[PDB]
Design a protein around this ligand. Structure first.
Ligand SMILES: Nc1ncnc2c1ncn2[C@@H]1O[C@H](COP(=O)(O)OP(=O)(O)O)[C@@H](O)[C@H]1O
Ligand SMILES: Nc1ncnc2c1ncn2[C@@H]1O[C@H](COP(=O)(O)OP(=O)(O)O)[C@@H](O)[C@H]1O
Ligand SMILES: [Mg+2]
Ligand SMILES: [Mg+2]
Lengths: 366, 379
């Protein structure tokens, strides 16, 4: 009884036993947000989906983007969503993953970082990196919440092609398959989400609408990277064009680590931001960093008329929940500063309207 | 090379290397909240503190209160906060922890659940409990983030007392000293927060005011439990007297063994103060929505006779609830996200409660105000 009452759990068991701790809610939620609907495009609706499922997807997408930092020659990302076969696949070019056995861990690097918990190349904070990768859980959580998870990576360097498959929530893997290789390097993660774990019948419209919009986010938050979806290249060419989709407008590429866009808001303070290609959908201090700067410059009263669009690269970011929707790192510990051109600060005044304040010269009488 | 680049961290290493993920922010934050200041009492001011620090304290406090759902006979919780010595201790009576060796982990239970990760007596969902604990990290996290963590529990049932100290972020631990016992069993854990991991120099005024308010929260949210703060007994007997601190017209009702509600008129927009299994749900959750909405409706009703989200904005509601396997969206359990369908119980206010609700300074203010706005011209 003492043994049945006081239990010790393995890590894998705990993740499956307490999902919401690692990937967020595995229950349905309903809330308004920007999605990209088939035939209608990017719009702001009400949506019902499981955050846990959107997350394991986001994890593999960001890893794809992250590879851009690791290798600048990366040119594009190819996303594939197929509801009927319940298949998702993310592909990226750029330096593949070293297909060689890891001397300390005693196993091939790919099998190590996609099949073992707490494995990562972002564990050394002296590197001060601007990747979304950080905790080393991501790819594994997706693997842990898939019925089938496949990893295929190719590195010219070690001149080999690695391919392996996991099944039943990473509870069993297939036989590692290696082949000689010599070509352009690529990596492709193909997974079948364990929809049972999320109490879903299939990849419905909403969740698909969310994911598709994320591919657009990537296409807009990364640099010199082309994003493909189901075979068609998305029409995003930088942040500005991306921001455009919402406005169909003061802009500025402060530097290599920033880019901001402002515009009026008839619906209170509106913000849309990204940190290392992560969709910080609730906010963060990186967004409050620019806002409060722009605001004060021309002065809460004014902020509420703003629709800010921020896209930054931050060193070793720090977030709230597992849904990483609200960043917190201190503006001091950013790795760079964001200051507007005299121009911007100027071409940003054409929001000012003491008109409502002036017109406030009404009189209340019986 | 490859070995230096791709690393595998250990569970303990990982927690220290990535705090925010287990205990929330390890940085200072500034927000408005109720706290209990020395000599002033409960007040709403601005506060600057580290969530992670508050969390490790809250994990041991809630653990003490969780024991009440384990031994209904528990009757007291004693809390000690010694800034000067950077020491905190939380004492509780009632059934102590089984001082015996765990046959599968081949080590004593106290040592197992306070020193090994992923250990809990709440991994059995079926059991259907209303404790704050559910993930088996809490205690280990207070330990991992303390320079010294001492665990002492006495158990009459096993005729023994246990006592062991851990040190340097659960990196090392002294020897386990056992002794005979047969008195009233109790559990007390003492720890010294590794302030440096929090960028702190000491337990300042702010963080202590918050830790002290939690002590009062426990007094107000646990059933028949006297609470002591540094040897002195907090003057709180049950939820109603707890709610009274916040006030210098109030509606009350203990719906059932798992729900207690207090309602008053608010002048600063919707207001809520609540608890789920003694956890401070500062940002609300489905449980507050469930009680509030049910009240707003009966009020909107008397509105038609003579405004909707407008009604909810005149309300100051207090909710103490016991929920089964509660869920939170954050590293702070400030917002309880479970659906009412899975609560494990219901909470339909009494016909006698709504009646009284219709009479407090509420409708007479909406109607008074609707009237006001009608007889107004804009010149
Ligand atoms: N598309 C990709 N290309 C190259 N390496 C990748 C890719 N996706 C993941 N990785 C590697 O796998 C690890 C990522 O696993 P993950 O669970 O997401 O942890 P994190 O992103 O926090 O580092 C890193 O060590 C990274 O180098
Ligand atoms: N004060 C206490 N009295 C009795 N048992 C306790 C106490 N504190 C902790 N425990 C035991 O230790 C475990 C709690 O560890 P914790 O890390 O807080 O996990 P949990 O999520 O279960 O609360 C449980 O198995 C519980 O029975
Ligand atoms: Mg990752
Ligand atoms: Mg606990």
């Amino acid at each position: 009884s003492v043994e049945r009452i006081y239990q010790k759990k393995t890590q894998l068991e705990h993740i499956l036993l307490r999902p919401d701790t690692y990937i967020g809610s595995v229950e349905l939620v309903t809330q308004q947000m920007w999605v990209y609907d088939e035939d209608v495009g990017i719009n702001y609706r009400e949506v019902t989906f499981v955050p846990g499922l959107y997350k394991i997807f986001d994890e593999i997408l960001v890893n794809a983007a992250d590879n851009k930092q690791r290798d600048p020659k990366m040119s594009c990302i190819r996303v594939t969503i197929d509801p009927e076969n319940n298949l998702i696949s993310i592909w990226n070019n750029g330096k593949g993953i070293p297909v060689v056995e890891h001397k300390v861990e005693k196993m091939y690097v790919p099998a190590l970082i996609f099949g073992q918990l707490l494995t990562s190349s972002n564990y050394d904070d002296d590197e001060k990196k601007v990747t979304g990768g950080r905790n080393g859980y991501g790819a594994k959580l997706c693997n842990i919440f898939s019925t089938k998870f496949t990893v295929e990576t190719a590195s010219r360097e070690y001149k080999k092609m690695f391919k392996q498959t996991w099944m039943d929530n990473m509870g069993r893997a297939g036989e590692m398959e290696l082949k000689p290789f010599n070509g352009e390097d690529y990596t492709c993660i193909t997974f079948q989400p364990d929809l049972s774990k999320f109490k879903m019948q299939s990849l419905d419209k909403d969740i698909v609408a969310l994911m598709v919009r994320r591919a657009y986010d990537i296409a807009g938050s990364t640099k010199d990277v082309k994003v493909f979806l189901n075979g068609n290249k998305l029409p995003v060419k930088g942040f500005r064009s991306y921001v455009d989709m919402y406005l169909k407008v003061i802009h500025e590429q402060v530097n290599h680590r920033w880019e901001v866009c402002l515009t009026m808001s008839e619906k209170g303070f509106q913000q849309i931001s990204f940190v290392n290609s992560i969709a910080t959908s609730k906010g963060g201090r990186h967004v409050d960093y620019v806002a409060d700067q722009i605001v004060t410059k021309l002065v809460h009263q004014v902020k509420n008329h703003m629709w800010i669009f921020v896209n930054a690269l931050i060193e070793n970011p720090t977030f709230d929940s597992q849904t990483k929707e609200n960043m917190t790192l201190q503006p001091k510990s950013f790795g760079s500063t964001c200051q507007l051109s005299e121009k911007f600060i100027k071409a940003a005044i054409g929001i000012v309207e003491s008109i409502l304040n002036w017109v406030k010269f009404k009189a209340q009488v019986q």
